[PDB]
Amino acid sequence: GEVRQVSKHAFSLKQLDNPARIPPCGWKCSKCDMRENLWLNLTDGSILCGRRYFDGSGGNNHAVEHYRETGYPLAVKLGTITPDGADVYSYDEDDMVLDPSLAEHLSHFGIDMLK
Ligand SMILES: O=C(O)Cn1cnc2ccccc2c1=O
Ligand SMILES: [Zn+2]
């Protein structure tokens, strides 16, 4: 249904050591020129573009391809982070999800969502 459910990955999510400081703006896909529709993988801090949909809309699928290679399931859409939350997608559950540990997961990358 329409309500975002808690991801089964949220509580125990692996976040790798020595993460990048993710800035508040100005990101690019590390695999192509895209500067919109960018997804920050919460395990490794990769910044990669959103899915190509079957109507031909969306990005160049770099975030989904990175999931296929790593299994790192949660990503947050850059530009959606506010004091009230963010757009979090689970590749494993194939749904938009709630991450009750979002503030801690973003703090890992030096992101203050409350700012
Ligand atoms: O685009 C991405 O790489 C992550 N993402 C984000 N939002 C979605 C919403 C519906 C269906 C698929 C997706 C999806 O794959
Ligand atoms: Zn890309």
UniProtKB/Swiss-Prot annotation:
Subcellular location: Cytoplasm; Cytoplasm, Stress granule; Nucleus
UBP-type zinc finger span: 5-113
Post-translational modification note: Ubiquitinated by SMURF1; leading to proteasomal degradation.
Binding site for Zn(2+): 29, 32, 49, 62
Mutagenesis or variant effect for residue 62 to A: Decreased rate of activity
Consequence when changing residue 29 to A: Decreased rate of activity and decreased zinc binding
Outcome of mutating residue 51 to A: Loss of polyubiquitin hydrolysis. Loss of ubiquitin binding
Signal peptide positions (record): none
Superkingdom of the source species: Eukaryota
Reported effect, residue 49 to A: Decreased rate of activity
Binding residues for substrate: 39, 51-54, 89, 91, 94
Family: Belongs to the peptidase C19 family.
Function: Deubiquitinating enzyme that participates in a wide range of cellular processes by specifically cleaving isopeptide bonds between ubiquitin and substrate proteins or ubiquitin itself. Affects thereby important cellular signaling pathways such as NF-kappa-B, Wnt/beta-catenin, and cytokine production by regulating ubiquitin-dependent protein degradation. Participates in the activation of the Wnt signaling pathway by promoting FOXM1 deubiquitination and stabilization that induces the recruitment of beta-catenin to Wnt target gene promoter.
This protein's domain notes: The UBP-type zinc finger domain interacts selectively with an unmodified C-terminus of the proximal ubiquitin. Both UBA domains are involved in polyubiquitin recognition.
Additional remark text: The UBP-type zinc finger domain crystallizes as a dimer linked by a disulfide bond between the Cys-25 residues of both molecules, but there is no evidence that the full-length USP5 exists as a dimer.
Subunit structure: Homodimer. Interacts with TRIML1.
Protein name: Ubiquitin carboxyl-terminal hydrolase 5
Species of origin: Homo sapiens (Human)
Lineage, broadest ranks: Eukaryota, Metazoa, Chordata, Craniata, Vertebrata
Residues of the full protein shown: 171 to 285 of 858
